[PDB]
Amino acid sequence: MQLSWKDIPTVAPANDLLDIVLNRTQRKTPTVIRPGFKITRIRAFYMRKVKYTGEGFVEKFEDILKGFPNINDVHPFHRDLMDTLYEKNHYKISLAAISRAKSLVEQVARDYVRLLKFGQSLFQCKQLKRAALGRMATIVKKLRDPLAYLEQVRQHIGRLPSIDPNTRTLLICGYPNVGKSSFLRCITKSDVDVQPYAFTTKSLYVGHFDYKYLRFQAIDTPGILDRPTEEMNNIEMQSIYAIAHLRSCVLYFMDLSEQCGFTIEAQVKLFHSIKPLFANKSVMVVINKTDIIRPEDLD
Amino acid sequence: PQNDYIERHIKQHGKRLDHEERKRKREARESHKISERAQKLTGWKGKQFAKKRYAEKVSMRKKIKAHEQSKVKDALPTYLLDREQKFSVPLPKVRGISEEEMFKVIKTGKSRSKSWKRMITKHTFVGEGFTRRPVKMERIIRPSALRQKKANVTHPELGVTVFLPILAVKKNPQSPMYTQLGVLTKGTIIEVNVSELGMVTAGGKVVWGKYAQVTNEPDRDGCVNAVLLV
Amino acid sequence: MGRYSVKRYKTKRRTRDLDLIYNDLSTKESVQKLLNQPLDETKPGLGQHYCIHCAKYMETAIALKTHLKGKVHKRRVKELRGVPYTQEVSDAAAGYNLNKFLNRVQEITQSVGPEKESNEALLKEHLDSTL
Amino acid sequence: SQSRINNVLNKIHVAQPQARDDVKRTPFIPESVKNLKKYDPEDPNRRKLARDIEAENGGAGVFNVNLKDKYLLEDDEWKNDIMPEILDGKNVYDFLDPE
Amino acid sequence: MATRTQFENSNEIGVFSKLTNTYCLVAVGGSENFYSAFEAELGDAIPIVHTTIAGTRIIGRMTAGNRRGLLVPTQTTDQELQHLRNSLPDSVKIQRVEERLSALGNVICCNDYVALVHPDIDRETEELISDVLGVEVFRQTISGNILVGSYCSLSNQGGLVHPQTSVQDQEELSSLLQVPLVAGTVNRGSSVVGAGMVVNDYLAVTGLDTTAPELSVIESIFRLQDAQPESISGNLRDTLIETY
Amino acid sequence: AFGPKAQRKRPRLAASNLEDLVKATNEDITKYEEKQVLDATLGLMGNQEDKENGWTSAAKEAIFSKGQSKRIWNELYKVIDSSDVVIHVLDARDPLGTRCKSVEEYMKKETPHKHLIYVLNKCDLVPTWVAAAWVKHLSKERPTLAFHASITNSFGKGSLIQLLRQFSQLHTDRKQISVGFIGYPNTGKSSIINTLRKKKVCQVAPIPGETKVWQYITLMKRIFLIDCPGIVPPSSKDSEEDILFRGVVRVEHVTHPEQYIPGVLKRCQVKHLERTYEISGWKDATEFIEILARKQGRLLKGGEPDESGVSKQILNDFNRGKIPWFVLPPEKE
Amino acid sequence: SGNGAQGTKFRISLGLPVGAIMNCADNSGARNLYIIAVKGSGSRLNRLPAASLGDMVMATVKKGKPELRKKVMPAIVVRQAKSWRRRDGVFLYFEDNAGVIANPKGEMKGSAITGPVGKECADLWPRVASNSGVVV
RNA sequence: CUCUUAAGGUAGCCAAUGGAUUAACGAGAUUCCCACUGUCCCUAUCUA
Ligand SMILES: Nc1nc2c(ncn2[C@@H]2O[C@H](COP(=O)(O)OP(=O)(O)O)[C@@H](O)[C@H]2O)c(=O)[nH]1
Ligand SMILES: Nc1nc2c(ncn2[C@@H]2O[C@H](COP(=O)(O)OP(=O)(O)O)[C@@H](O)[C@H]2O)c(=O)[nH]1
Ligand SMILES: [K+]
Ligand SMILES: [Mg+2]
Ligand SMILES: [Mg+2]
Ligand SMILES: [Mg+2]
Ligand SMILES: [Zn+2]
């Protein structure tokens, strides 16, 4: 699998894209034509303008469409993660808007080249070329919102950690402030921040280690509250989908000092509630913070 | 690195020791830089700079006006609110178009000695069931790229424009010959299919055909624009 | 330099060397392997009808027979009669590796020579019988 | 799964010898090799490596190493001696011989 | 006792060096970093010799030898041969060999006691190998592969063959060599193991790109560490199942 | 939806419970595994492994794209625009292979007043019942006429002429009608026109691109016939092999024809091939070519058989009708 | 000097311009190779790109396995008929032109090379040196 | 008033053959292959 999508070129917004493509035409194609030349020369001048501008827009749109991942063809773990992060409906609608713009720009270029074949003077040929470029500009201006959305998506999706859903994985999960990030820091060299407040970790973090000449990956998750799925939010959806998809050893962390802000009864309730999630996955319960209180001296 | 690693790096390590001062001096130098650019940029870049400066100043004036206005302070049904959208013709007189402009001489023969075929340089409506006449007897040429079937019609009522199919050419003001050839120039009266506008007569009949006047030059802009005659 | 010599003995039109053919004829196993070849599509005569002395394929057995009855083949047979002229001969004529060259000549006269002669006799009589 | 079984077996096997002769074939480790002290990059008193000599003399591509310095000869003054190769159209090397 | 290094960013250690029990040969190219990588493990215990063969750098593939002998091809100059003789002590025999198959490192795979040779080497070359290297000589292929010296890596303790070598071929070859054999790769999946690494009874050097499982198999089969025999196939079975 | 000012914090459609979530995700994983297995059966075995060794398939030869030039398609649309009746000429050996479905669609959508019919030419190259079955199956869609084109010994000439007379009588309002002949190259359009005229008025050749411009032919005072250059509609499913076996390309410009010889063996009956070439005993295409070359004496300098020349002649025989073959008609219901 | 090559390469007389056919010296089933491009080639008007010993080329198989045919693959030139100067002091040449099939890293597709291999090519390409039985 | 899709399993009926898909010939027009080469890479040299 591709597993990582940092190699998407920058998406210019609509006005910037218009500047780039139209100025590229004005720079890279000749600009001097005279009304005293042959009509064949004048028509070729304006046809070249229209065709070159159309090709510039088409190449920008193609670079957008080829770079971005195919949400329905990726591994289902990545599909669910990107759906949580970026709202799959908006994702596909924006990319489809880009595709529609590409088709419309190609149609406009073809139509006006065909018309320009019958132009009789510099004035008429120039008017036809201006009409073609203006229609292209109108099409591009209608892409303002999807382009801004896709630029934000590209920047965020380039920084996602690369997770292999078919390798050896240790998943780390539990309530907030139970020691998940601290344990990931202890066993890997990942730089996840450790803080005494809930939801310091707002996205999945990955670390690595070696055991018996094999590379293992460990996943730190944001904490899970004991809520139904209907009122569960996207931050917890990341952990839920990680636990549901990644075949692994799930390590459920428990704090018996209750310095996480949650009682032992609540932590046991959370375990028994997320019990359907780890079926056919290896499961261990790690009681952290034994330097404060030990399971031996419980009530 | 993963997630927001630059933000985490700034939180854990700070910025370069001269960051604030350097940014502050750059912002202070901005006024001189803008004046220097306005006086030193040339040609296309200078024209674009002046255009953008005018737009920014207009935007700032509008924001100031809105702020001060705020600081000072159709009768639709329930299911339509919270929702958004003389018998003179509009063009009584148009530019005269001669036959020299309308037609292009087409030369035939090996040495181009014959000159009897004529090509129409304007846009045309050829009607339904058009078949080209055989090339030996085809004097008038109406090429397929210049044939149109649909027009952008603006209704004076409700201010909407719809892409409607062309039914006929009623009156080309230049000549009845251009009318019978179907030439679509500025000021031509056409018949349009108004079925999607949902018009009903006083007797309950559905209107599906009305008249419109062409308001542009399709040979110059590649499309037919017409205003409905109501 | 001249066109005839250039276009006959161009490097891309080179032929097998006489010492190599002498080694091909010296051992019985090489003789049998070169006499009985697999059906190769890219050789004349499907890889059959091969004259070892001239290192040459013939299209047919009758072509091989008419070739064996010829002054060209007899010229090659005469050429392959003596010592095969290695670099050792030139070195010894310079006066270098003399004992090595003399040992090689003794081995040719004692062992390798008569065995090659017996193989050639058997090969000629086999060609007479089969042709 | 029975699909990745044969190749796993074939690559997990270790072939073992069995007799065939009464000849002793034993590993040979030199005494200096077995008495050698382990090299430590982070150690004040270590052996100076040839790359350290190169770095102090010229660096890579500037240092010109002397290949004759390791010669094991009868006399050490003979190390930087030029061996003649030609004498009057003759190679010295193919006349060079004891006795 | 398996180390990883590169010769000028090349993982082909066995192409550019030769290692026996009693001496080491290295190519002259560039800096002294490759020489110093060998020197960091060997000290002054055995001679480490800069050398060229026919003015080239591919000396592990051009030469073959063991702790008693060193065979160079006929393209070796008198000066290179003399330099080698001056660098090595008299306990190592040095011989220049008149063989058509001049890549002696590719066509001979040997240790202190036995040798596999290319099936078309000369009888005189075989006698010279037996006499100078002091070994038994067997004409062999590694599962149909001539160039035994590049498709096998051998010491007195064990042997590594290319990973497409069948079980029966491994058993017959192991009986011939009287050392345990295993099949594997070097340098992250390369099949040319003999040209990928060098090894003797107490040291092995591979490329940096060799993975940890490949290195563990190499150490196991050559018995390099203090308590690492060739019988830890059972102990590494899980790692090898996950890797293969 | 996303970004600095985003207000979505919850999924739009949450799972009903964790049991539903895990079951749906397990089904999704299984579907993904099966789909990836299915595409690994072909694509990874093919295209993906070529990049690992750096191998690339050679460039598509520009000859296989003949019949797709803007000049030819301009001519085709000109003849359609001028024609009241359009005759689609089909090969009786492979009619569905020689159909131009896209042009039929365009005619039915944009010019419904033009009358499109089928003429099944080269009906002498197939058995009688094959031609009858093909006429029956194509008549369910369009009026189809079986035909054998020849100036002296033709079949169907009177039927075609009386059909065109009926079309003229229907369009008695027009003073004359035009019948444009369209189809693949080498299907016999010029031959049919020559047959209707009983005179060689249009150039006929087996080489594609013999007709380069349109040509008017007066059949009667009220009926004109328009010859048109052949067209090949582009497709993605049709391969270079299919294009070659439809008689579209010039075989002398293809690079390696021995690779297309096994297609000849697949499309032709073995007994028919061995009767045509007086040979036998081959077990593969290379053996067949070698045996044919040795029989014909098509040897190069040095005894190598001329595989490429013999393959080009074989492909020409197949396309020009010196080897019997046909595609079976659809089954009777 | 090509990706996978080991070090610099000094200039050798060119013998194989584009359109040449050399033999295939490996055992991968190809019989000859037709040169269509030369890696590392310069640019000059009208000048044909040409290859020497130790160069990487893009080649097609004209004779051999149909599986090898209709594919453009890298090859490394191991022998040439054009004479070239060795810096030790002799001009030399081989009987034929010959190359071997490789991947873009310069790794050998086949398992062995028949015939001699030029020292310059062997020293430039370590995998050719490993698969060579004869090095001149 | 009526008209066309009855034809079926790799060669049929009906009158050696079912032909112009015409041999031979050609300073006639055209494509390709082998051989061959200073046409070219890339030009050098000799004679009158
Ligand atoms: N006494 C003690 N405190 C801990 C331990 N691990 C974490 N903490 C404290 O618990 C707080 C939250 O830990 P954190 O790693 O952020 O847990 P997370 O929210 O599940 O990732 C931090 O302030 C730590 O100081 C432990 O093993 N012992
Ligand atoms: N056997 C047979 N051959 C035909 C028939 N019609 C045409 N051909 C041959 O097919 C080839 C191509 O004919 P042509 O008229 O040029 O096809 P076009 O490209 O569609 O105009 C010519 O060699 C014709 O002799 C037919 O009815 N039967
Ligand atoms: K044709
Ligand atoms: Mg945390
Ligand atoms: Mg035609
Ligand atoms: Mg040029
Ligand atoms: Zn002979």
Author numbering:
A (entry chain b): 1 to 299
B (entry chain r): 2 to 74, 85 to 96, 117 to 261
C (entry chain I): 1 to 131
D (entry chain b): 350 to 448
E (entry chain y): 1 to 244
F (entry chain m): 140 to 472
G (entry chain V): 2 to 137
Task: Reproduce, without paraphrasing, sentences from the article in which this PDB structure was first reported.
Biogenesis of the large ribosomal (60S) subunit involves the assembly of three rRNAs and 46 proteins, a process requiring approximately 70 ribosome biogenesis factors (RBFs) that bind and release the pre-60S at specific steps along the assembly pathway. The methyltransferase Spb1 and the K-loop GTPase Nog2 are essential RBFs that engage the rRNA A-loop during sequential steps in 60S maturation. Spb1 methylates the A-loop nucleotide G2922 and a catalytically deficient mutant strain (spb1D52A) has a severe 60S biogenesis defect. Nog2 is an essential hub enzyme that acts as a key quality control element during the nucleoplasmic maturation of 60S, anchoring both the pre- and post-rotation states of the 5S rRNP (Nog2pre and Nog2post) via extensive rRNA and RBF interactions.
Additional evidence for this model comes from two spontaneous intragenic suppressors of spb1D52A (spb1K767N and spb1E769K), isolated during our genetic studies. Both mutations lead to a near-complete rescue of the growth defect of spb1D52A cells. Although these cells grow nearly as well as SPB1 wild-type cells, Nog2 is GDP-bound, showing that the suppressor mutations rescue the growth defect of spb1D52A despite the premature activation of Nog2 GTP hydrolysis. The suppressor mutations map to the structural, C-terminal portion of Spb1 and insights into how these mutations affect the binding kinetics of Nog2 can be obtained from our recent structure of the NE1 pre-60S intermediate that captures the Spb1-Nog2 transition intermediate state. We hypothesize that the suppressor mutants destabilize the helical structure in the C-terminal portion of Spb1, vacating the region around h92 to allow early, unfettered A-loop access, improving the overall binding kinetics of the Nog2 GTPase domain.
